Amino acid sequence: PLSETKCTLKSFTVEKGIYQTSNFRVQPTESIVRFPNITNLCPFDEVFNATRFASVYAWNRKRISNCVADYSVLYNLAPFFTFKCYGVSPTKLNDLCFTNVYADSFVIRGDEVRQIAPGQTGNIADYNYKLPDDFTGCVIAWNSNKLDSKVSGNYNYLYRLFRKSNLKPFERDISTEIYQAGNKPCNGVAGFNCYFPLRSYSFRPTYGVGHQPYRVVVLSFELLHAPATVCGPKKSTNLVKNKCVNFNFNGLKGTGVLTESNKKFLPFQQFGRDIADTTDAVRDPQTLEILDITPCSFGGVSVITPGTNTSNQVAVLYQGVNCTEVP
């Protein structure tokens, strides 16, 4: 602390007197990360865990709003065939809150795995279902050979080869109408210049690579100016009282200690501030408790010393801090 006087005053000769150098501050050690409860789970079992399905034009959306969906146990397990998407990682979907979540179920052939892409053209995606260019989600295939398959084929659901024009995304066309190539009217049946688009499924587990049933769920993600009612889970830490720590909350980041607060609070209130707009009281997200936020213990350091040609003896003054609070 004699050398703390020489660094602040920028001189090697210290005159006789009292000089203020720096401020003592207790540094934080641990960190508290909090996240709320996983309660009110959402029915995601109508797509992934569902027994039945539909065809590629017959697909039924599942409306997911105002609930907590758990994708976190699926990413740590992952019995997934192929997941491919563009620009948004599927492992980064768990900590983000999304406003509009839509999900569907449709089963495709094994040559149609490359026919599901953002911006995909062909005889499959343009005539049945394709992904738009502004689509921010990601798609996960799942192997249907242990549940959804059938011996020798599936004759219950059929798919459409052809369509008279190109079909937009966010469209469901259930129509049975025959594609007309020429000027001859087809009248609902095949004939001259008429192709019959309806083909049965070839799906069996004992056939080859080029046709296999695959459960394909498209997760439609949309972020609007409304706040998000659907969030994914996040692993949190414990709660430490009466120690100097860093704060990581949902709506707050700071540094201080946690003490018991006697102030009353609102049930819709997370945090509240004082005159300086600094948060002195916070609600715990998991359970109902109010904690008084106080900053860590600080004080000024004054150095009492004689001259450098007289003595090296150092007397240290701690201003505002009692002697029991020095350790």
């Binding site: 300086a276 600080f298 000024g300 201003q319 505002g320």
Partner: peptide, 22 residues
């Protein structure tokens, strides 16, 4: 007739020692 980083320096001469000058 509450600490944001602003402190109040105490005075040197106390008010009991002012009255012994008085």
């Amino acid at each position: 007739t509450k600490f944001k980083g602003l402190t109040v320096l105490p005075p040197l001469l106390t008010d009991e020692m002012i009255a012994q000058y008085t």
